[PDB]
Design a protein around this ligand. Structure first.
Ligand code: CL
Ligand code: CL
Ligand code: MG
Ligand code: MG
Ligand code: MG
Ligand code: MG
Ligand code: NA
Ligand code: NA
Lengths: 107, 108, 108, 107
C-alpha cells in the first residue's frame, strides 16, 4: 500500500473550499494575489523590523515564533491561490528553478 | 499489507538543503535575510504585471509570460522553505492552523 | 536688494532629525533597517487597494480612503528621508540625475 | 527678495513633462503606482540582501552608493507620480504624521 503525500495539493483543496463557499474567486486576479503576497511578506518582515544583529534575529524568532508561523502561512496561502489561477505546479516550479540554479552556481 | 508512505515535501526540502550546504550558504540564512529575500522575489513577481490596467489584461500577460511567473513563484517558495528550515516551522501545519482561524473570523 | 532663501526641505528634515534624536532612535537607523521600514510602509499603502478590480474602482477607493493613503505616503517618505540622512544622499539631486538617465533610455 | 524652494513641487514639473511627452499618464492608476513603489523599494533592499551586520551594511552603502542613490530616486519618482494622481501634498502629509507621532511617542 503506497501513500503519495502531496501536501500542497491537499492544502489547495482546503483553500478552494474556503474561497468558493464565500464567492471570493472573483477577487483572485493574478495581480491582486501577487499584491496579497507582497502584503503578507511585509507582515513577516515587520516582526524583525528593528533588529541589529543575526543574534537578535534568532531571539525575536524564538519569542515571536507564533507570529512568524502565521505570516509564513499567509504568504503560502496566497502563493497557492495564485498557483490555482495561473495553473502552475509550485513543486515542479521549485524543482526546475533549483536545476537551473545548479548549473548557474556549480560546485 | 505493508504501508509505504512517500514524503515528497521532505524530498523537495532535501534538494534545497543539499544546494545550500554544498555551497556553504547556511551562514547567510538568518531569519531577516530570508524574509528580505522573499520580499525581493515577490517584487520580481509583481513586476511582470506592473502596468496592467484590467483583470482581462492580467490574464493575457499571465498567459504570455507564464514562464517568468513560474520562476518567481519558485523563487518565493524556495526562500520561504529555507526560512521554514531555519525556524523549524512546518508550513503545511501553519496553513492548516491559519485556515482554521480564518474559518472562525469569516464564518459561513 | 538682499536675497533670502528658504530651505523648506531642510526644515522638514530638521523636524525628522529632532524626533529621532530626542528618542535616541538613531542607533536603530541602519541602512538595511530603514530599507526594511520603507518596504513595510509601501505594503501598508498597497493594502488600501488590495482587492480592487478596475482602475475605475481604485479612484473610488482612493477618494473614500484618502486619509489612509495620505498616512502611508507620509510613512514611506519619512523612512526614505531618514535613509537619505544616514547615507548622506540628496534625494532631489538623485531624482534629477535619474530623470536625466530616463531621458536617454526613453527618448522623445 | 524671497526665494521659497519647494523642491518636490519642482521635481514634479520635471516628472509631469516626462510622463506627458510620452503619454504614460494613462498607466498611472493608484494601484499601478503603489505597485511601482513596491518594486523599487525591493530594488533598494536587494543591494543589502545578504549582509550579516550593521557594520557590513555601512560598508555595502559606501561601495554601492550609486546603486542606493538610484533606487532612492526610483522610490521617490513613483511616490511623487502617486501624489500627483491622488492630489496629495507629500510634505504636508509628513508634517501631519510627525505631529501624530509626537503625541503617540511623547518625551
Ligand atoms: Cl512530506
Ligand atoms: Cl531645501
Ligand atoms: Mg498576515
Ligand atoms: Mg527571482
Ligand atoms: Mg504606516
Ligand atoms: Mg530601480
Ligand atoms: Na545559528
Ligand atoms: Na554608524
Amino acid at each position: 500500500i503506497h501513500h503519495h503525500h502531496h501536501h500542497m495539493e491537499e492544502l489547495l483543496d482546503i483553500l478552494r473550499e474556503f474561497r468558493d463557499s464565500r464567492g471570493w474567486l472573483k477577487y483572485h486576479t493574478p495581480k491582486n494575489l501577487a499584491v496579497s503576497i507582497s502584503i503578507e511578506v511585509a507582515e513577516l518582515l515587520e516582526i524583525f523590523q528593528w533588529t541589529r544583529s543575526s543574534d537578535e534575529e534568532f531571539e525575536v524568532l524564538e519569542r515571536r515564533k507564533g507570529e512568524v508561523e502565521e505570516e509564513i502561512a499567509d504568504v503560502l496561502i496566497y502563493l497557492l491561490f495564485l498557483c490555482d489561477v495561473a495553473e502552475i505546479n509550485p513543486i515542479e516550479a521549485v524543482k526546475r528553478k533549483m536545476e537551473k540554479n545548479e548549473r548557474k552556481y556549480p560546485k
